[PDB]
Design a protein around this ligand. Structure first.
Ligand SMILES: CCSc1nc(C)nc(N)n1
Ligand SMILES: [Mg+2]
Length: 209
């Protein structure tokens, strides 16, 4: 059973700005997703301090970057807190309505697209490089779900039929044809060093056969 939802007006407006605005500095999408992963990892780490059983779904707190040139996908995986179905539907746990309003006002006052993460809506920067985004998530309190959107004002949510993940979030970026540089090992290493050099969790960049 696949449920189809309309994005709230503000989110459709934010996604349209990301997709339609001429802005060459697209590489910042990666630090925004890594920042989201780091925040999710902090959340499960903090909860686990008072309830160690919260890590029964996996003790390792890490971030993996997985390029796949055959499928033209770049996947960001973390073993963070994950999201319940309700939080996935509610703009992937973000304050997207108020954050978009504040971000739009900031853009009128001299801010630029790279500041998106400052407003709590950095996830949507995925649309700088992806024509489609699939988010697989598993929270300790809910089942595994797959969220997906190619923008156009709608997203879908279904229970995930894929392999059980334990706990956390996988963001699968189905890259635009002209954005394949983000599948290159040297390019990913360069961006991680430039924008995400010192973070609280290990980042492993997978290589390809
Ligand atoms: C902190 C909520 S879990 C989460 N949410 C997003 C938007 N991304 C990631 N990695 N994890
Ligand atoms: Mg922060």
């Amino acid at each position: 059973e696949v449920e189809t939802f309309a994005f709230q007006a503000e989110i459709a407006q934010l996604m349209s700005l990301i997709i339609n605005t001429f802005y060459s500095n697209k590489e910042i999408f990666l630090r925004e997703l890594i920042s989201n992963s780091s925040d999710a990892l902090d959340k499960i780490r903090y909860e686990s301090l008072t309830d160690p059983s919260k890590l029964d779904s996996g003790k390792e707190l890490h971030i993996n970057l997985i390029p796949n040139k055959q499928d033209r996908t770049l996947t960001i995986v973390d073993t963070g807190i994950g999201m319940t179905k309700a939080d996935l539907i509610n703009n992937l746990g973000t304050i997207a309505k108020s954050g978009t309003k504040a971000f739009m006002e900031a853009l009128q006052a001299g801010a630029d697209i790279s500041m998106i993460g400052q407003f709590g809506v950095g996830f949507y920067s995925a649309y700088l490089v992806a024509e489609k985004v699939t988010v697989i998530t598993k929270h300790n309190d809910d089942e595994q779900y797959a969220w997906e959107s190619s923008a156009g004002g709608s997203f879908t949510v279904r229970t995930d039929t894929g392999e059980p993940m334990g706990r956390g979030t996988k963001v699968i970026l189905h890259l635009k044809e002209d954005q394949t540089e983000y599948l290159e090992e040297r390019r990913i290493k360069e961006i991680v060093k430039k924008h995400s050099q010192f973070i609280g969790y290990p980042i492993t960049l997978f290589v390809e056969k």
